[PDB]
Subunit: 83 residues, 3 copies
C-alpha cells in the first residue's frame, strides 16, 4: 500500500538543480548590486566635480571680462587724447 | 492501489520555498533596474554638461589669446617707438 | 503496488513553470549586466574628461593671472611716472 520512496527522490533532484540556478542568479545579482552601488558613489563625485568646474569657469569668465574692460580703456587712453 | 496524497504535499512545500527565493531575487532585480535606469539618465545629463563645459572653456581660451595679442601690442606701442 | 506515474507528472509541471520564471529573471539579469558594463565604460570616459577639463581650466587661470599682472604694469607705467 505505502509508496513514496522513488517520488521524493525525484523531487529532491529537481529541487537541487533548480536551487543551483537560483543560486547562481543570486550571486550575479549581488555582484551587480555592489557594482551599481559604487557606480552611484562615482556618480555623486562626478556631479560635485562638474558644479565646482562650473563655479571656477564662471570666475574665469568674469575676470576675462574685467581684463577686456581694462584693456579697452588702455586703448582709449594713450592713443586718442591730445598727442 | 491509489497513492499520491503525501507526495503532492512534498512537491507543494518545495515549490512554495523555491517560489519565495525566486520572488526575492525578482524584487531585487526590479530594484536594480530602476536604479540603473535613473543612472542612465544621470549619465546623459553628465554627458551634456561636459560638452557644454568644453564649449565655454573654448570660448575662454580664444578670448584669453585675444587679450594676449592686444596686451602684446600695448607693450610694443608706448615703450618702443620714438620717445 | 507500483505507483509514480501521476506524481512525476506533477513534479514536471511545477518544474517547468519554476524554470520559466528563473529563465526570465536570468535574461533580465544578463540585460542589466551588459547595461551596467557599458555604464562603467561611460563612467571611465567621464572621469578622463573632468580631469583634462581641470588641467585646461588651470592653464587658463594661470594665464589670466599673467594678463592681470601685465595690465597692472601697463597701468602703473604710462599714467604715473613723469608727465
Amino acid at each position: 500500500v505505502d509508496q513514496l520512496t522513488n517520488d521524493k527522490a525525484r523531487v529532491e533532484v529537481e529541487r537541487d538543480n533548480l536551487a543551483e540556478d537560483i543560486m547562481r542568479l543570486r550571486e550575479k545579482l549581488q555582484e551587480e548590486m555592489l557594482q551599481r552601488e559604487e557606480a552611484e558613489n562615482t556618480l555623486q563625485s562626478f556631479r560635485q566635480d562638474v558644479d565646482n568646474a562650473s563655479l571656477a569657469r564662471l570666475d574665469l569668465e568674469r575676470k576675462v571680462e574685467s581684463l577686456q574692460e581694462e584693456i579697452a580703456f588702455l586703448k582709449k587712453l594713450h592713443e586718442e587724447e591730445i598727442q
